[PDB]
Amino acid sequence: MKIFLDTANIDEIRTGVNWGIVDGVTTNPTLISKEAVNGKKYGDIIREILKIVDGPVSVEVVSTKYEGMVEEARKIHGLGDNAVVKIPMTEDGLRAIKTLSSEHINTNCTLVFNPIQALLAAKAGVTYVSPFVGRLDDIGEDGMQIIDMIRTIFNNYIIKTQILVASIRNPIHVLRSAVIGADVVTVPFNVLKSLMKHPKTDEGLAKFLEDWKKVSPDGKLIL
Amino acid sequence: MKIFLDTANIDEIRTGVNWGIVDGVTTNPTLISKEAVNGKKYGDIIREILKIVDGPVSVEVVSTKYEGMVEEARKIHGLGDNAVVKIPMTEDGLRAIKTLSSEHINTNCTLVFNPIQALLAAKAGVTYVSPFVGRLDDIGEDGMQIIDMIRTIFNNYIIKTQILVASIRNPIHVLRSAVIGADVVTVPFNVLKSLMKHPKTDEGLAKFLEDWKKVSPDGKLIL
Amino acid sequence: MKIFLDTANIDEIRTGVNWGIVDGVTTNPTLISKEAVNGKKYGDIIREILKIVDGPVSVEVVSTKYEGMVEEARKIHGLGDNAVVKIPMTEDGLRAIKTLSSEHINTNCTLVFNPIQALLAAKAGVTYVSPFVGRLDDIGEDGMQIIDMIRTIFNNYIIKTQILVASIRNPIHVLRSAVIGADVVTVPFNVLKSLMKHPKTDEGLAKFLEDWKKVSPDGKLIL
Amino acid sequence: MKIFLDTANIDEIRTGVNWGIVDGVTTNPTLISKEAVNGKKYGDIIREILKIVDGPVSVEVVSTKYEGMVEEARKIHGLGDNAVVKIPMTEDGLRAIKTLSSEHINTNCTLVFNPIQALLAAKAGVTYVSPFVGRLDDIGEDGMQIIDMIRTIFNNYIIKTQILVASIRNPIHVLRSAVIGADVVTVPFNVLKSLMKHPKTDEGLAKFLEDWKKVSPDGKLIL
Amino acid sequence: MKIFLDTANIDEIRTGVNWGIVDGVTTNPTLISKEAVNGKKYGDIIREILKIVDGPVSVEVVSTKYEGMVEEARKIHGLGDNAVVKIPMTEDGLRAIKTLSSEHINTNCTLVFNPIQALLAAKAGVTYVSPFVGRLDDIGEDGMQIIDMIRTIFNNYIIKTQILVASIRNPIHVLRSAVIGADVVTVPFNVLKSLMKHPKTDEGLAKFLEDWKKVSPDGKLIL
Amino acid sequence: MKIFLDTANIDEIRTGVNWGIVDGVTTNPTLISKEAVNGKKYGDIIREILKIVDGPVSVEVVSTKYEGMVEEARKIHGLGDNAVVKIPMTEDGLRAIKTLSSEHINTNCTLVFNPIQALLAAKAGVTYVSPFVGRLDDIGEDGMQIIDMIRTIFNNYIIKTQILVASIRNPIHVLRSAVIGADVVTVPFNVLKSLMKHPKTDEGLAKFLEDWKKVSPDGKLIL
Amino acid sequence: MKIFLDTANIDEIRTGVNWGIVDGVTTNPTLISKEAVNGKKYGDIIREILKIVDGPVSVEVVSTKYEGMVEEARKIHGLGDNAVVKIPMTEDGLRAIKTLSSEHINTNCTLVFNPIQALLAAKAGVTYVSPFVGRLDDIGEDGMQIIDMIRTIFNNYIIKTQILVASIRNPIHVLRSAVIGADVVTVPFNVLKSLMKHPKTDEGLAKFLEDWKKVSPDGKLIL
Amino acid sequence: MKIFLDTANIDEIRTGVNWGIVDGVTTNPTLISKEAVNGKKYGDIIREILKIVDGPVSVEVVSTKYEGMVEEARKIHGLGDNAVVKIPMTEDGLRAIKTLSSEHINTNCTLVFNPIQALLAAKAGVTYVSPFVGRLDDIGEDGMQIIDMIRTIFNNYIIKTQILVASIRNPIHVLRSAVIGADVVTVPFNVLKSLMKHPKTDEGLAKFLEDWKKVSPDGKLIL
Ligand SMILES: *[C@@H](CO)[C@@H](O)[C@H](O)[C@H](O)[C@H](O)COP(=O)(O)O
Ligand SMILES: *[C@@H](CO)[C@@H](O)[C@H](O)[C@H](O)[C@H](O)COP(=O)(O)O
Ligand SMILES: *[C@@H](CO)[C@@H](O)[C@H](O)[C@H](O)[C@H](O)COP(=O)(O)O
Ligand SMILES: *[C@@H](CO)[C@@H](O)[C@H](O)[C@H](O)[C@H](O)COP(=O)(O)O
Ligand SMILES: *[C@@H](CO)[C@@H](O)[C@H](O)[C@H](O)[C@H](O)COP(=O)(O)O
Ligand SMILES: *[C@@H](CO)[C@@H](O)[C@H](O)[C@H](O)[C@H](O)COP(=O)(O)O
Ligand SMILES: *[C@@H](CO)[C@@H](O)[C@H](O)[C@H](O)[C@H](O)COP(=O)(O)O
Ligand SMILES: *[C@@H](CO)[C@@H](O)[C@H](O)[C@H](O)[C@H](O)COP(=O)(O)O
Fold it and tell me: Cystine design at F126: which of D182, F121, G50, H183 (Cβ 3.0–4.6 Å)?
């Protein structure tokens, strides 16, 4: 399972990349507009992320119409080979995906909330589909159930579109995505940070340290 | 999973095709006779649909006897290479399918209401079999259970006949079909139009628009 | 399981009532506005339904504010002992339900789309809660799963609020509701009339009639 | 589980009753017409069955309209206290059941093919409901599944209507009915006979006889 | 669960009774005729067993006809109040059980090999029914499945006939019977003797003995 | 799944073969003796069946000893390449199968009633094994369970012997065989006929005809 | 599934072999010592079995120490290419297995009572592992559950050691072994002879014989 | 499944290695510090284990920082080609594993307590991952459940990292690990010695010994 960071915060991205556990990044218009403040321009932020991240970086078109989406998608693609164009699940978006796929431009279909929307995005040729699990949780439906159905559907038809689980809110969305077999999860920085941690890891390290001091006062291993 | 449009309404078909989410069309004598009124000839409607739709178009014979079925099937076939001949599940129909298969004319067995009828159609060599789910729901039996059994049976015997789920009434028929792994669903236009939609997609788009205006008052993405 | 008719059409109601299979009626502002045309007044329609139907008749408030909802509710109550006041799942709506419940005015919480909304309506003291199954089906979620969870939750806490399944679209919503154990379904007229029918019933009657004529020419049963 | 005999053959009835394994009888117009041959009159057949059988005896009305059904039902009821009036699952039928129930006349609703038909009959106050399992098997649906759902539904609502499984064709219909918990099965004579039998019973008897001869040449137990 | 000994061997019975784990005895013509050799009379064996065993003792009739069965049953009954009359699952046997039940003579229906035979025996009023599990195992059917179905059926109808599992061949028949909830098992002596035993019991006792010698060389507990 | 006809009635065979739905025929000595009446000779009946039927035709030996079975088998095989020799599950039978398999003569082991009998037949090299499901139903055991276990066993060991389900009594035996994945079912003619039929097929045909009349009074499809 | 005979009785072996259903033989020191009486020598018994049986013949070492076990093993090996050396699950036994496996001497690890013992024997390279099911049943644990776990473990790791189920007591140990997919069962003679038998086989043959005599007086099948 | 010894005690290791059932060894700072007392040096202990164990020997770094971990790892590697470097699940540990993997130095990530930690370790390229089951049991969660999830996740993504189950406390941890399909278990010496043993193995050997003495007074097997 690939793990992407879901943020436009450059400090977060630099930190996660330096950890070597980040395989790519997703952004969206809300995340970008959050960071583009106090003199920061959205063009600069987008370019900076593309440069810092080796892996896929998803950037969302803002046009709602086919022609505008395709024009923006081409500009996004032009910014770097790792750029992936994020396109919403709408009639115009499916049309844009089909055109862009034929032009060999990688795509990510977003704002997906049920398995049939996901199947339609796959049929348009999309590179990644992003169902939102937290926003479903918000409205009282267990969002992970949709991921499970999408995985079964895609398995049934040998679909090559990757499942990129989005709107992740906690480490159990991550755990359940891996057990289901989603291709990618994209996670906010707080969640990413949590993933490596467990109290028994800390406790075990402390005990090893203490026991080793018994035989090596300076705590060294000399071989 | 292929998605066909189940109508003879030329306006619906043009619209669906332009959406890019329609892989073929199914008709039947009721659908066609509904459209062929106030001057419109059934022969013209059939030809127009064949012209408009790139993918398979199912057209049903009206003869109840073997010889008449085959004679009608050949005429249907001659109207275009994308024509598929719809034949009912009857003794004469099974005979006609067998003959037509040997002539390399694609066939679609219809009015199937249990898994054994579907198996018989596959044994006759039919290209598609169309179990009806809504008409079973109508009489108090969950039609989707028949689809589930047909998929299992076809899997068991590595049967190449495609399952083309028909009498679809709602988007859950479509969802359950995809999870089962049916090859094709054919849907009325009202159902088709609902498949792309979800209130959280609309809501997320509105929020993205609003947030983006904060960094680009005119609402565009200049890269 | 009680069976209510979901309509404001007097002809449908008179017909279903005379069939003996209708235990009550649910209306809403859309259904009533459909009928209040060609000079028919909504006030007359409502009173007429109350008169024809011996069982519960739900009638929806139109105000969105607490004070207006309880004013309208008391007026609805004043129309007949069988009136039930339909109130939407909103903050004001729950406050209204709590007040009316204490006043011993029967209530029906509507526009419920998940089990926790249903629980909140029950906690406010509502007489009936109406989850909408068809409108969930519309958006690609199997609405019956919400009925199943609500039944489990209500069982857990011995909740006395009745589950009144609404937005019913077909006879399998009705079947599944009965197997789950919902207290009430409310169904459109087209669904109601289908519930008694089965082709093997018709076939079986025809055969019995024919056999009997073999021993009683006139077809009589003289005892 | 009560076991009824499904026949109008007087000889079978006498034999079954004398085996002591028969709790009642069901007839229908086909079964009776079969016996009312060569001078035998249907009215005499019906009266003799009521006489020979201590348990319930189902006799079906032939009229298809409400007034005729109620008139014939009252006549059937007048023939003896053990008479039960068989009424078909129709609009008129349900009305007749309601009326007759209020007159304390026992009823059996017949020609039921799904669980919602059975529920409607129960709601009309019917004494017994008779779903047909063999005729469902005939059309490629496992009829025992309908009995299972009806049992669950009736359990949910504490329904007092008895499930009387009909159209029984083999001993596994009987076994499955008992495991589900149906109130009554009605069986043809040939099925009835087979229920007492097993090759290991016969084999064990033969062996006990042979072994006992060794200790008692005359094969008696003298105590 | 009661545990009966399935033998006519008086030595086995005395031994089992002295162990305190035998609640009753079952015999049959094969078991008795096995013991009644070289002078020993079957009448004496039966009387001795009735004297030795406090609990129920099943003794089988040898007549195959109703009148002979009942005459033998009454003689068996007169030998002692703890006698239970074993009657085979046949038409004549069901008749005899019914008569004997009305006379307050306890009965045990034997040679039962499926759940419907067991139900018929319960319907005749039998005190115990004895399905055979080993003889089913002999012919390639898992006999315990029949016990499981009988328990479910008897539970469904609140049947008071006790399930007395017979033809027991090993301790897992006994374990599975207890987990299912059979009322009684009847076991051959070899199986009986194994039930108390386990290698870890012996091993734990040996260790306890050894450890105790360390604080009390003579091996006693002085308190 | 292949469908064979289980009959020696020449008229049924001709009819079934001409429906095009029959892949072979099974006979046995009872079926043949039924036809060999009024001058008709068994040898002529067998030869005619081999002639009319292109697929396998099972003909049963009557000898009970190894030498007689092998002699009769060779004669049956000599009558035509499509002849398959039916051999009973006995000690001599298994030996005959082994010999005949080494002689490249196709075999069908019959009178199988449990899964281990079926495995032994497969180990002897038999071409088809025929468990009897109806005769198990007769004695109160669901015969389809044996087919399920045999399928699992044969899958485990990659056994090439084909499962040919026999003693079929109804269309649910057929449905369950297909869902399990049995290689072949052999069915009586009356069952065969019922497999193509469904009341909703007939009803849908009638409706298509009526609707088409509106657009074509003569009910033809002129293209 | 292979079927071996678990005995040292030459008469039983000759008989089972001549039946054609015995694929090999297992012995042990108890079985051999039973037979080596009245002047019969164990050395002659073993060589005689090796001669009669074409398949694997397991013969158990009596030494408890590594050196003795490999010495005896090599001598057993020297008796015939079909000899298999049975070695118990002990520390010395595993060492012996590892040595012999490298010497290409076939081995059978015996006295296995749980799945981890079976895994250790496999890891030592053993040809066959023999878990004991009956001796577990003796102590109140269902021994077949251990076979199921061993099959799962061996599947997980693609282990080539064959599972050779031993301490078989009845035909359901054999049935369950086949459904689980054990490679081999070894069975006592009394169990072997029961595997071919079923009362409905005998009953069916008798009926076929009678019917045939109706058309062939002599009972011949002349073709 | 590979079985390693989890200890730094040379006597235990020498013993297990002599038994032939130990495939490798794991150590940790606590285990080593335990043995390195009363003059024993940790350097000698580590080298000694490397010398006598043919298979993988895991040795843990003590540094908590990336540079120290990588340096200590290279030193461990240099001690022998069977050394595996144990590295804790921390940020600097994952970085170290990635570097060491690129240097073709085998690694074992330790102190793993949930499946997502295990996944991150795999993503870093670790050779083995070691989730701790006993320490989870300690804090009241069944640690084997984490092993099951890790197996499923690794299967989903065809991950080549081996699951090395650690903190093993009893033989049921070993059994469950094998049933799940873990690649390796590492076990304390007390657990290891218990794996070969079972009381029925001992009892069976004693009986075989006793019986053989009947045929061979000196207890030998002469062939
Ligand atoms: C792109 C893939 O769709 C990604 O940035 C998504 O847009 C975000 O994961 C969601 O919008 C986050 O929503 P949430 O409601 O904050 O969890
Ligand atoms: C052809 C079969 O592939 C297709 O047009 C079917 O005839 C229709 O789907 C059904 O007739 C539609 O029936 P419904 O009762 O309207 O749902
Ligand atoms: C009242 C709730 O008991 C009832 O009238 C509901 O308002 C209706 O059942 C729904 O509004 C019907 O919606 P649909 O989308 O037409 O199925
Ligand atoms: C009455 C219902 O209690 C009963 O006589 C039923 O009418 C019969 O069981 C069925 O008509 C029998 O039909 P089948 O198709 O012969 O099985
Ligand atoms: C009486 C029934 O309660 C009892 O003695 C039974 O007759 C026996 O348990 C069986 O006959 C024993 O048969 P098996 O074939 O020896 O196991
Ligand atoms: C042969 C097996 O392939 C086949 O003819 C069988 O003999 C028959 O199916 C059975 O004998 C039919 O028995 P039933 O009891 O009539 O169902
Ligand atoms: C060898 C293992 O393949 C085999 O002879 C076994 O030793 C026997 O199957 C058992 O010893 C038989 O024990 P039981 O307790 O008589 O069933
Ligand atoms: C190393 C593999 O990670 C191995 O030595 C582990 O460190 C041990 O298995 C555990 O530390 C043992 O802990 P426990 O709490 O004693 O069971």
Answer: F121
